[PDB]
UniProtKB/Swiss-Prot annotation:
NCBIfam families with a match to the protein in the record: PRK14038.1
Gene3D superfamilies registered for this protein in UniProt: 3.30.1110.20, 3.40.1190.20
Main EC class the enzyme belongs to: transferase
Keywords, comma-separated and alphabetical: Carbohydrate metabolism, Cytoplasm, Glucose metabolism, Glycolysis, Kinase, Magnesium, Metal-binding, Transferase
Residues that bind ADP: 279, 329-330, 417
Activity regulation text: Inhibited by 8-bromoadenosine phosphate (8-Br-AMP).
Pathway the protein acts in: Carbohydrate degradation; glycolysis
Gene Ontology annotations of biological process type: glucose metabolic process; glycolytic process
Catalyzed reaction equations: D-glucose + ADP = D-glucose 6-phosphate + AMP + H(+); D-glucosamine + ADP = D-glucosamine 6-phosphate + AMP + H(+)
Phylogenetic lineage: Archaea, Methanobacteriati, Methanobacteriota, Thermococci, Thermococcales
Protein name (Swiss-Prot/TrEMBL): ADP-dependent glucose/glucosamine kinase
Species, as recorded: Pyrococcus horikoshii (strain ATCC 700860 / DSM 12428 / JCM 9974 / NBRC 100139 / OT-3)
Active site per UniProt: 418 (proton acceptor)
EC number: 2.7.1.-, 2.7.1.147
């Protein structure tokens, strides 16, 4: 496998920028990170009222309308050491948070994060959808062929949708509480992304914008609820159809969607996507909502994820959607089921696994050339064991086989899931 890993990287290294442009849509925001300090926190709590704050540290509010609710929610996460996120619907509270400030800024949303990766690192032209492109928002994009449609211009040439993170380490102490695990609470001063807001220009002239791309990656659907999914899903469906009529392949990393009704709806929406990516948790979630409760559990029961179970789950997915490309990724191995055939599918998976391994050690991919670092990372033991399993069930030749007109491709691993499926999707078609 090591030789195939080297050859794959070498090819993608030279071919990835062949992609003429990638359309990235919907969710983009600003992440404002604050490393909490006990003195500062306790002082602010006393100012607003210790008793008030405490009540919310016991029962998380539905939303954050007042300062006590904000601080209490922070405490809620601390005393339990568990993540939680709530919308800040009060101007007053947003102003409070703005003044409170932050220690570091980071690009948020899959659109912004992939623009920086695909455009800022891989050198591929990116057309991004940014709900609110403020000066601060724009400053978070890296240099490179990163654009937004009105002619295409760089973000820097164009309100703040800020998510305040409030992070604390394990055993962080405040009042008489102690964090049982390193975590964070997020105050989202953003009422655009939660509803999958779409810029007016993208609603009115999507075809013209779409024509500047070769591939598309859609994200931001997971937070939609049964109450607000109506209009956005209809819009996304309209865009997908247009993309499909143009020959533009669209991809989606099926991020966990809490609302079960929306989850099922996005599953069916896949009939209009060319490609979908997901891990064991997301696959189990999807299979479960399709009624296959038995499979769902069996897909996440064993570790590594039971390969036979995963494939059966994947086959159920294709049966209901006809999705032409599926990229399954977990710790230990990746699997792809594609109507398109060839070793290029394997080249792409291998390249994406190297990207993941690189971001795993380095913690951040800054140059394409840095991916070569993943070459020296030994192949996982679990990876070889799963291969043994799949060679018993299928006639795999160097990780390649087939099933029901779909090519099956396996790869032993050494990437936020997004870095993985996006890198493989884009690299695969750069070779086409």
């Amino acid at each position: 496998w090591e030789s195939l890993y080297e050859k794959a990287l070498d090819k993608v290294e030279a071919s990835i920028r062949k992609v003429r442009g990638v359309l990235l849509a919907y969710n983009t925001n600003i992440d404002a990170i604050k490393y909490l300090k006990r003195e500062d926190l306790e002082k602010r709590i006393e100012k607003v009222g210790k008793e008030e704050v405490l009540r919310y540290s016991e029962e998380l509010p539905k939303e954050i309308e007042t300062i006590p609710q904000l601080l209490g929610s922070i405490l809620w996460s601390i005393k339990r050491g568990k993540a939680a996120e709530l919308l800040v619907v009060s101007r007053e509270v947003r102003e409070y948070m703005r003044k409170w400030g932050w220690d570091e800024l980071r690009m948020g949303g899959q659109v912004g994060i992939m623009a920086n990766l695909l455009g800022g690192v891989y050198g591929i032209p990116v057309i991004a959808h940014v709900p609110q492109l403020s000066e601060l928002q724009a400053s978070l994009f890296l240099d490179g062929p990163i654009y937004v449609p009105t002619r295409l211009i760089h973000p820097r040439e164009f309100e703040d949708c800020i998510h305040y993170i409030y992070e604390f380490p394990r055993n962080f102490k405040v009042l008489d509480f102690e964090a049982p695990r390193e975590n964070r609470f997020i105050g989202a001063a953003d009422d655009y992304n939660p509803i999958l807001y779409v810029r007016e220009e993208w609603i009115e002239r999507f075809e013209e914008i779409a024509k500047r791309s070769e591939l598309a990656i859609i994200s931001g659907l997971h937070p939609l609820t049964q109450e607000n999914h109506g209009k956005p899903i209809k819009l996304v469906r309209e865009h997908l159809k247009i993309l499909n009529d143009l020959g533009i392949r669209a991809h989606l990393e099926f991020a966990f969607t809490p609302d079960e009704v929306v989850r099922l709806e996005i599953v069916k929406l896949l009939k209009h996507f060319y490609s979908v990516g997901l891990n064991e948790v997301e696959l189990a979630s999807v299979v479960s909502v399709m009624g296959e409760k038995e499979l769902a559990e069996r897909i996440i029961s064993k570790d590594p994820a039971d390969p036979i179970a995963v494939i059966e789950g994947l086959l159920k997915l294709i049966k209901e959607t006809g999705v032409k490309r599926i990229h399954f990724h977990t710790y230990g191995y990746y699997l792809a089921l594609t109507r398109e055939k060839g070793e290029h599918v394997r080249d792409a998976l291998l390249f994406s696994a190297l990207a993941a391994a690189t971001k795993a050690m380095k913690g951040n991919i800054e140059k394409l050339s840095d991916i070569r670092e993943g070459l020296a990372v030994p192949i996982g033991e679990q990876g070889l064991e799963v291969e043994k399993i799949l060679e018993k069930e299928f006639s795999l030749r160097d990780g390649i086989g087939s099933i029901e007109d779909y090519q099956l491709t396996f790869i032993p691993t050494k990437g936020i899931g997004d870095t993985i499926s996006s890198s493989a999707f884009v690299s695969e078609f750069s070779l086409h």
